[PDB]
Amino acid sequence: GPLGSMGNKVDKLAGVQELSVYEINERDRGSPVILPFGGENGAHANSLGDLVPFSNKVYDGSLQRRLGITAGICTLISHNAEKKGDRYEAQYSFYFGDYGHISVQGPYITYEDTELVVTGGTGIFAGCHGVAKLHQIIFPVKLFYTFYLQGIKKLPEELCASVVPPSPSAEPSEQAKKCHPSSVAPNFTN
Amino acid sequence: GPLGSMGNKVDKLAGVQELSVYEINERDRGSPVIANSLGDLVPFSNKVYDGSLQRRLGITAGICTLISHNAEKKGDRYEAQYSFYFGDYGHISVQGPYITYEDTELVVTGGTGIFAGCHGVAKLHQIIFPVKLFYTFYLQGIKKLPEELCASVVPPSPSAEPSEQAKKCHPSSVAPNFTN
C-alpha cells in the first residue's frame, strides 16, 4: 500500500547492516612501501610527511573465503619514541571482486583501535554511507574490521557467514590462502 | 498535502540522476606528473567538457597512487582521489580504482553547489588511454540538474571532439566562470 511503500523506502535509507572482514599482509605484494619524504648516519627517522602506499589481502569474516584486497595510502601525522600512538591519516578502498568496493577515510593509530569514515561504495555497496571499526590483531600485518553500512540492499549470505572471533591465532583456510575456486569471491581482486 | 510532502522528500532522498562528461588531456597543463614497481605517485589535472561536447565546464584535479602491475593485461592498478570542477555550479569528488587496461567504477563521495549532499557512483569509460575518457555520474539525493548539463550526449568514440568554440573557451560555450 501507499504507506507501506513509503515506509519501506525509508527503512532502506535509514537501515544499517554490519559486515566483518580480515585484512592480512602476507608479505608477497611488496607492501607496504615507505616514502621517507619527511626529514643516525644513514638511518631513517619518522616525521610528518612520510607517505606509505600499501595493499593487503582481504578475507571474509569466517576466514574461509578470499574476497579481494585493500589499496591506498597513509600519511604520517605525529609520532614519538613510543611504539603506541603514532598517528597516520589514511585514504583507501576495500575491493570485493565482482561484488564491488568500499572506500574509507580517517585515522590509523599504531596499537590503537580507530573508526574510519565510509565515504561510499560500488556494486552492491553503491550509495552506502557509515563507518568502519579498525581493530589491530597483530601489528601491523593482521587487522580486523567491522563496517556499519547504511542505505543499501540486504547483503548476500556469503558475506555474512559466522565470524571467527579476532585473535592472533585466527588464520585463513588453506583453500582460501591458495585461492581455490570454492573459496574465492567471483573474480576476487588481486 | 501531508503525505504528498513526505513522499516528495523521500523521492529526493532516494532519487538518482545521470550526468555525463568528457575528460580530455590536451597536453597543455604539464599533466600528469609521473610507472614501474609500486608506490609511484601521479598528480594530475585535465579538462572537462559536457556530455554534448559543446561546452567547457572545468577540470579534474587530484592524485593517483600506483598499486600493482599486471603483465598479462599489460596494465597498472592505481588508487585515485580527485575532483571534477564545474565552475560556479560546484564540484564532485570521487575515490576508487583507476586501472590502465579497463573501465572501472568509482565512489562519488559528495559534491558542492548544485551537487551539495549528493552520493553515488561514477562509471569511468576509457576511449583512448590515457588522453580521452568518458564518465557517467549516478547521483543520488539532489534536486533536478539544470538543462545546460543534460544536453543530448554524444556517444563516446575516437571521433568525439569538443567543438571549436568550447576548445577556445568562447563565452557562448563555457560554464559560468568555468574552472581553469
Added chain:
Amino acid sequence: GPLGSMGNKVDKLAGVQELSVYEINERDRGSPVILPSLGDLVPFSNKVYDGSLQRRLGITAGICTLISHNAEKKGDRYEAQYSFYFGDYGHISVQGPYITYEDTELVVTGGTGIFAGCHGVAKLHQIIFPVKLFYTFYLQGIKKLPEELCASVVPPSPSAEPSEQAKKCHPSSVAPNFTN
C-alpha cells in the same frame, strides 16, 4: 503514531545543522611540510577550536597536492583530503579545493561518532594566510548536535583568538579527551 514515527525519520535523514570551527597553526606541530609547480605534496596538522573560541576540540590532519599557479591572482590551487578530529565526539572527513587567494567549499565525505552517517559541505574561510582559518560545516542526516559544540559563534577576524584556558587545554575548556 505511525506517520509521526515515519515523519521524524525523514526529518532526520533530510535535516541540516550548522557547525562552525576555527583552525589555527600554532607552530608547535612541525606543520606543514612542503615537497616538490604541479605535484608538490603538503602534509599538515593544525589545532581546532570551537566556534566560540572558548574550547579546544582537537586537530586537523591530512594532505594537500599543488595543482596549479595563478600568476594573475598571485595564488595557488591545491586539492586536499583531510579530517577534523573532535576528541571523543568523533571526526569529520573532507575532500576538495584549497586556494590561497580565495574562499572555497569542500565536500563532507562523512563522519564518525556523533557525526556518523553525515554528508554535506564545509565552507572554508581564510582569515590570516595561512595560519588561521574559519570553517562552517553544513551537516545532513544526523541527530541534534550537543550544546558544547553549538555555543554563540565569534564572527571571524584577524584579532579572533582562543581563550587563555582553551589555549592551555584547561579541563574546563577542552572537548572530552581532545585530540592532540
